[PDB]
Design a protein around this ligand. Structure first.
Ligand code: HEM
Ligand SMILES: CC(=O)N1CCN(c2ccc(OC[C@H]3CO[C@](Cn4ccnc4)(c4ccc(Cl)cc4Cl)O3)cc2)CC1
Length: 402
């Protein structure tokens, strides 16, 4: 008897870095803002698959971000690590979301990001210096894509880059965790490290966001010590793991579209617009779209009930053809405005403009310093991370004219 279902398994895994999984193309192609899916443990949930309905639902305070709710949609057993408190503000609703978020925004302003450009350029060209001096073949991930945003986010936070071996290993173990025990261990490892850093700042006040939170909000009782740990850990992992994935997938994608990459090198004024298109097209943080309804929500004749899980799948929303004509075509010249790679609304990515800065500087540096850059293995041989985490590749063999 047939196996066809009306609530297919979710998430799906990419088989090409810049292509929707087959099941997601199916969801994109079916009319209506929502579709039922089956999560890993058999629970049904809703996915949002259309662009404006995704903006609307991201804007709806009845869809809560509280990951500790028992009805929050967990997409893998590893969710239990981040299901355990205290949540950073990414998992808070108004008004608590605002009080905590505002403790960090000063580090991510347009003015501050502008002020970081000389640092980002120096760090990028330093790791390129070292990689190009050693000659090919190199893994772009370990040699460049990951160290660059790690060094930058360390100075922003006041986390000593000398500890990068420890905290990068713990972050990777957390990001890649496929069961709760592995994820909790990695999280506990980072948590204890950050607790010791807090104690060091209480002895010796210091620079960086962590040092600022310790000396002010923590000392006034306005943030819990373990809330500070959760917030710093969010920013540290988002600050280097997510951006690193965006670099490697962008390089793969541009090399698979040689005409567009050549147009980009020939006119660097196109880089900001290319960055927006790559963000729309690669949408690497599908995993960040989970919500839980605290009240019934009517959506174009379909009803979300209080207690149901909803996942706003921004990658599928970003392929909405009513917003992006020929949505599966990479076009660095198109209008990629209003894309949802960073979300929308009160939770829109705090790091978005640092990510935009870093990708711009990195793309120009690679075109400047390594114009002969090419992959050292076929694209099909690369290993893509599954849909249960941030999209990316575990390694990226590259070569170039030595
Ligand atoms: C290409 C890189 C990145 C992408 C695609 C991305 C994606 C996202 C998305 C989709 C959200 C919305 C989550 C939701 O609605 O629940 C978000 C939130 C957030 N991101 Fe990013 N992110 C990136 C880089 C960064 C960086 C570099 C940081 C630096 C610390 C960062 C920090 C945050 C924070 C703190 C939030 C929570 C915002 C809030 O709850 O008010 N992200 N991100
Ligand atoms: C639920 C599940 O399957 N898993 C496995 C993947 N996990 C994971 C993945 C990435 C990660 O990096 C930093 C976290 C911080 O926020 C996200 C998304 N993000 C990244 C940058 N800006 C936002 C995120 C990621 C996962 C989930 Cl469920 C929700 C969210 Cl907002 O990454 C930290 C943990 C742990 C939970």
């Amino acid at each position: 008897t047939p196996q066809t279902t009306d609530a297919p398994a979710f998430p799906s895994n990419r088989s090409c870095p810049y292509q929707l999984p087959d099941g997601y193309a199916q969801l994109r192609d079916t009319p209506g803002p929502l579709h039922r899916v089956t999560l890993y443990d058999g629970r049904q949930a809703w996915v949002v698959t259309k662009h404006e309905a995704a903006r609307k639902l991201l804007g709806d305070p009845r869809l809560s971000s509280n990951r500790t709710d028992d009805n929050f949609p967990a997409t893998s057993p590893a969710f239990e690590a981040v299901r355990e408190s205290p949540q950073a503000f990414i998992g808070l609703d108004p008004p608590e979301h605002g009080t905590r978020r505002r403790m960090t925004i000063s580090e991510f302003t347009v003015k501050r990001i502008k002020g970081m450009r000389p640092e980002v350029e120096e760090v990028v060209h330093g790791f390129l210096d070292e990689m190009l001096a050693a000659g090919p073949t190199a893994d772009l991930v370990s040699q460049f894509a990951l160290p660059v945003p790690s060094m930058v986010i360390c100075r922003l936070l006041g986390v000593p880059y000398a500890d990068h071996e420890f905290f990068q290993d713990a972050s990777k173990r957390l990001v890649q965790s496929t069961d709760a025990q592995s994820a909790l261990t990695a999280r506990n490892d980072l948590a204890g490290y950050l607790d010791g850093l807090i104690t060091q700042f209480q002895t010796e006040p210091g620079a960086g966001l962590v040092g600022a939170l310790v000396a002010d909000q923590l000392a006034n009782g306005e943030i819990d010590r373990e809330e500070l740990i959760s917030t710093a850990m969010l920013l540290l992992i988002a600050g280097h793991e997510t951006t690193a994935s965006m670099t490697s997938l962008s390089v793969i994608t541009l090399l698979d579209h040689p005409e567009q990459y050549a147009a980009l090198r020939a006119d660097r004024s196109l880089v900001p617009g290319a960055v927006e298109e790559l963000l729309r097209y690669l949408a690497i943080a599908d995993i960040a779209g989970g919500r839980v309804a605290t009240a019934d929500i009517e959506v174009e004749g379909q009803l979300i009930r209080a207690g149901e899980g909803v996942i706003v799948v921004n990658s599928i929303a970003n392929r909405d053809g009513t917003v992006y004509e020929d949505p599966d075509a990479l076009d660095i010249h198109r209008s990629a405005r209003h894309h949802l790679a960073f979300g929308f609304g009160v939770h829109q990515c705090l790091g978005q403009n640092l990510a935009r800065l870093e990708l711009e500087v990195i793309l120009n540096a690679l075109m400047d310093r390594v114009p002969t850059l090419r992959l050292a293995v076929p694209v099909e041989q690369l290993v893509l991370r599954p849909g249960t985490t941030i999209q990316g590749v575990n390694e990226l063999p590259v070569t170039w004219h030595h």
